[PDB]
Symmetry: D2
Subunit: 472 residues, 4 copies
């Protein structure tokens, strides 16, 4: 048995109690991570508070050098990290190695982007002539101790997208890796520690949501909460964070609005790739197709073909559809499928289940009464909703309680721009699948899909405070 331990104040620490992690594919005992106690979690935050000053007292280029060394150590260990990440969140082996290398690239970009944050030198005289001799120098300072909470679906990539923009800002961070995927967060901590980052600048917390989960969020040293997860927990984090600054990125039901003049082969390929990447267990995925009744039949057949050519197996065979993360989620997916299937929705793809591994289901003839039309599954299920006009498509898309992303497949671009401006959403992709995209691109969700704006530049900006120095 491999026993992993938390990085606290530059040191490795085990707790009295431990948590054992099991593969979502084999249920094989994968390792063990410590289960910390409220007191051991205070010690970690006191270490962070004590390491804050000497760390934000460095120049940006030195801590950027630390980040670059971490990225190099990550990239040389891509297979070692990737195989256990694949084992732990049931991800394809090429996909896991891919996110490790994409994480290294994200860390490099964040290091060189937080290294160029310039301020302002505002003047006074265009507002009043009595304040004409007052220059204000508006620079930007770290918020302090940033607590990053990572999702299971990307334990290395979303955690790093939280860590690195904080660290380059002069900002001490504490990571809480998810319960399923804590080994990956601890391997990221291993890379950070081997890079030589000072003691207390990067710390990890592992435990059970019952003991230290809400305690670390409501702590006084914590200055910024950066959370990725689902809306039930995001609502709590928003309510009990207080007046304190937060960044939440919760779920979404991204719609693929397909119109009359649309390249339906391109639309079908892009929709299936987006919808069934990582079994649909990703927040930025197409989770409903809203297509006009004129082209809906051609689109349905094309989608059926694309979904049929998807391989459904083991992660290490690089299957397209690997088993979902646990049995509770598979039960939720099966409930959504049963509700849709008993309400007379034609299933264009076979519906079958072997434990966690459940087959991609493509539903057609979906109405407003089936729950698969409204709820985010995180499973390989894709409803097809048929509407009469583009106005009904806009109304149906905007009737969701979520608003991350959308796709507006069409051929007229003034029409796509009109539709994109009418969609209550954060990002509109025209003629493409929804992505978190190049990570310089902004990433946000509106309505109940999040709070704050992600992306490297905006993440670096958000975990900082502006300070004006006003003189004559």
């Amino acid at each position: 048995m491999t026993r992993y331990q938390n990085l606290v104040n530059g040191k490795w620490k085990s707790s009295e109690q431990e948590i054992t992690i099991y593969s979502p594919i084999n249920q094989e005992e994968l390792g063990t991570v410590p289960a910390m106690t409220q007191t051991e979690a205070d010690e970690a935050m006191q270490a962070a508070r004590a390491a804050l000053p000497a760390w934000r007292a460095l120049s940006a280029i030195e801590r950027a050098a630390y980040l670059h060394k971490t990225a190099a150590i990550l990239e040389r260990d891509k297979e070692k990290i990737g195989t256990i990440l694949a084992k732990e969140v049931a991800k394809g082996i090429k996909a896991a190695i891919g996110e490790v290398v994409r994480t290294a690239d994200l860390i490099r970009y964040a290091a060189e982007e937080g290294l160029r944050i310039t301020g302002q030198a505002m003047e006074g005289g265009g507002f009043e002539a009595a304040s004409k001799n007052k220059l204000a120098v508006v620079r930007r300072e770290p918020v302090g101790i940033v607590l990053a909470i990572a999702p299971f679906n990307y334990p290395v990539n979303l955690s790093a997208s939280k860590i690195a923009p904080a660290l380059i800002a002069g900002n001490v961070v504490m990571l809480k890796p998810p319960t399923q995927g804590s080994i990956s967060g601890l391997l990221l901590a291993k890379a950070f520690e081997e890079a030589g980052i000072p003691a207390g600048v990067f710390n990890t917390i592992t435990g059970r949501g019952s003991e230290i989960g809400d305690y670390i969020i409501e702590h006084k040293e914590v200055n910024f909460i950066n959370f990725t997860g689902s809306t039930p927990i995001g609502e709590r984090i928003g309510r009990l964070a207080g007046m304190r600054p937060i960044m939440l990125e919760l779920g979404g039901k991204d719609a693929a609005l397909v119109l009359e003049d649309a390249d339906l082969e391109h639309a079908a390929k892009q929709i299936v790739a987006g919808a069934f990447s990582y079994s649909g267990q990703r927040c930025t995925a197409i989770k409903r197709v809203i297509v006009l009744e004129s082209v809906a039949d051609k689109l349905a057949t094309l989608l059926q073909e694309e979904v049929s050519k998807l391989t459904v197996g083991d992660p290490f065979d690089n299957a397209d559809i690997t088993p979902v993360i646990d049995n509770a989620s598979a039960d939720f997916i099966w409930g959504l499928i049963e509700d849709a299937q008993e309400k007379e929705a034609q299933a264009l793809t076979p519906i079958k289940r072997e434990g966690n591994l459940l087959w991609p289901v493509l539903f057609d003839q979906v109405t407003k009464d089936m729950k698969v039309a409204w709820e985010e599954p995180f499973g390989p299920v894709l409803p097809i909703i048929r509407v009469a006009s583009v106005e009904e498509a806009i109304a149906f898309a905007n009737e969701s309680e979520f608003g991350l992303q959308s796709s507006v497949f069409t051929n007229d671009f003034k029409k796509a721009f009109e539709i994109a401006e009418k969609l209550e959403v954060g990002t509109v992709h025209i003629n493409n699948k929804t992505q978190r995209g190049p990570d310089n691109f902004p990433f946000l969700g509106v309505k109940g899909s999040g709070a704050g704006v992600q992306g490297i530049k905006y993440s670096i900006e958000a975990m900082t405070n502006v300070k004006s120095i006003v003189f004559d």
Copy 2:
């Protein structure tokens, strides 16, 4: 007996139950504002949600034209608005007219600044080569409905600072005027309605807090809370908002760090002019003087002289020290003064209380144990703190619960910059009093002084969502 009404959906409505306003000067009946209910608040919110699309659909220059007309009408009626404001919050008559003028300037600037917001057009090829043919046209969109809960100390200026940056961005607003100062907010609504602002884009909500307060501040149709007020109430609003965006401007106890190499005459003038303005009832006022023991005696002498030159009396006599707004607040300042007196603090100025009319009190020899050294009085009392080192001064300043603004009074700007970067505060004024400043300057409070960055450009960017459209530049 004047009965004011609420601007709801472009029409003046009144409720069957009304609140009476009494001037803090004479306790004279000053008017009567509606005290409306849950359902009337629902109707106003529905009117705004219906008024969005036709107002979001307007171009920026048309929305700016409405705001320019509002500012012209506000400059037209300086004396009427100013007299009613002076009566209602016990503010000097010359400073009430000045607040109306500053409000008109603020909303002109907000209109011309919000019609000038540019998006980004970033590319993917600098991040990775597989995204080289990808353009994100990232622009800005309204949040929707904005609550603009305003404070008593500036009912016209600090409500327009929330309204104008919201309306120019494409938002529609609910204004909740303060309990004491509601008539001033309704007069600002008069100006807005007379400007021809479309129906439902500006709405006002007056009522008893325990009825239409937490209700409106947690409605599902509210998209942004913009609140100025007290730190406890700000805590509750950050709680009740949820994951909705908020701007909170809360209290602050601004420090005036005075060092040895400091021009003590200028420091004394700035400190008194900052501390005893509107009887200490601002949030960016000097509230602590932290001075090195080397120069503390000369500083105290100059401070005492200039506090003594201050005028106490009637607002219509343009007195520097007008009555405070409540009996409860007057009792709060009295309790702080009593705690300082009982604990052997050297009062350098007479302590008097003729009703609401507290007297400007300059306390010296203030220690860490008195409450006046740690609590925001919103009254004309100014403690003097003595420290033996600049590090000790920085530690004492950073022990505060508030982080709004601070002054460093010195002659060496290199060390002034050092101290300024060491102060846990939002703005540092070097050799000058703290102030909300040229409203184009950023205005924030770290710690328990608030959440969000204010200032005209910053407020326009705050009440606005990011929308990016990503497509292939093939």
Copy 3:
């Protein structure tokens, strides 16, 4: 016998000699302007140099107040300015009044844009760790005396697009109104003097290009040359300026690339409006149609139908084509037409001339051998050029020695956005005619079509110097 004067040092001065101005439509005496001599130009430069400091030492808000007063006076005299402008450069009355209104709006926008020029505060610690405690406050200061040389096409709009963006920056302006249109530049000067702009801040120089034309461009007091005109004079004064900053706005041969999936009725209307507005005498006009071979016949029919509805007459009837500015230009345009006609190009519209008044001529079947395919006519002539593929269209468009603008008419925007990147122009309009456009938008020409970037923000930026004030914050 109306006599106009030059605004120099806040006062009006006439010279010994004069230039008589004749209407391009009636040849009737329109007035006289002074023919300044070199020493008078020196005195205007000296007045400007003496007025620069106190103008620089104002607030942006005060200079903006001056600019706003000028814009109000301009909009007050719409018809008085517009009638004379139409008489002097043969614009339509509606066109001339619209020009004056557009200049008023441009001055207001430039005023409100010059108030919001923010500098940056740069740190050295990102570049190297030895410079971490070193901060650069990089702001922007006026270049000094800007000389604006205006065109005849827009003698009020393309003169205020140089003066207003400079006066807001703190720069003093010397205006050289065009030879035809000099009355208009002195009528704009009257608005600036009635506004009350300080003495020396705005001065005018009307003379002969032989006596005071390279003398003013080669003066030592001039710190920025802002010129709009034709490419030969632009080449001359670009070489003639030396190291001094210049902004050249020269000619263009804007192409309308029309593709097979284009909406040909929209394309035809857009092309005709752009090509024959002000009878082709704009720099930013469609000067050639590069239509693809498949849709060329249908596009030519639609183009012929819409060129046949254009009213050819006099200004005061608001005709579409009015007489060209002078006889030399009519002769040059006639030479281009004759060359095209003898080269066997089919003329789709009648070819007729009545003095300066040329009828719009639409040429089809134009090859690269005809001079109308390459040379800019500044008159009512539009060649139609047929190509086999979009590669040949792009090659033919890029074979010109002028950049400036282009219009790609198509229905696939990922194709228009790909052709736009291959076009060697400053601005590509997609499914619309070329235009200087919202004056907030960038306006630039590449190749031989200009130097520098205009647009209100970029004009304000370019006529300023960068000043960095690096110090230590240790």
Copy 4:
């Protein structure tokens, strides 16, 4: 006898004739560089024009990768290029190694800077309601072929400061290394070719100035000229470029204004370090001390001690003062010293010459009538000027014909910031010496000291053209 070759299409060519390079230290043989003819320059131009589309096409990550590899190879061969550079320009050996390291750092910063270049996305709503639905995507495009010609001062660093910004912007470059320092530029080209930079995107041109040069500047294929050198040559290049964009960095007398309250001990050290780094042969070195008469004697004594500490000798052994670049410059500096010595200026340090090696000379009592007070010596001598007031100091500093940089040694930053706004320079260092600085900081000269803004971001923005793709959104 090493034979060096020019890089063109990724291949090394040599010409028939060649120029021999002699070290300024001992007139020793360093090698020969090609002396190409005008036809070979045409072939290099054509190679770059052919390489441009494929370099423009590939993404910014890929160009940045090439630049990063060049920087790594420069780090690898510090010692080789360092020793060759020290022999070639009589640079101190540690100074030469340091220049190569700083060059690699500049390459890396420019590559990472070029990825972040983001465009605007403008709307027309706030200028006009008519064009509310119009959106302009304003991005940035390379000029084409950039011609960078380097100085002898820093033939590796001031070469790279032109190569890297242009070449990350998407431009292809060809470098004309100095006559004395060509071997160092060819070693830079060696690093670029070894990194695997594509063929034709980086070319090198060496030869006699009277043959290829001037022809090189006047070529039709050159789109940008980036020159650093002397003011007389830069003025010729400004005339000879025409309307094409240029960026010129020329000489300067960086004044050191020392005031009453200045920390004289710190000012003396800063002044001597700045004035005598590389024995006076920098453009941004302080070449002139303006000091108030009351503190002038103490400042002069401190300056004398600091100058006496300086070591004179051989570049190996790391002498502070090393032989000047050639004998013509040694004669020019000696003529300036003779003129100063003639008119009763008291030298505080021995005047002494050993052919090419000059001793540092600290002159006092320098007046307006001596040439050393107004001519740039590019040699180890600085004058001290006595003034009676701050206004007199500012007037004397602004009588110069050069802008560039200047230092104000004081203790009141509010006074220094006021003197900085009145000094006609590009950058003003408060209480520190003039320097090109963290290369992220803006570097500009304002009057006869140059044209354009350098600095890494500013040089990237200068090498590029604006492009708009205005289209309709509704």
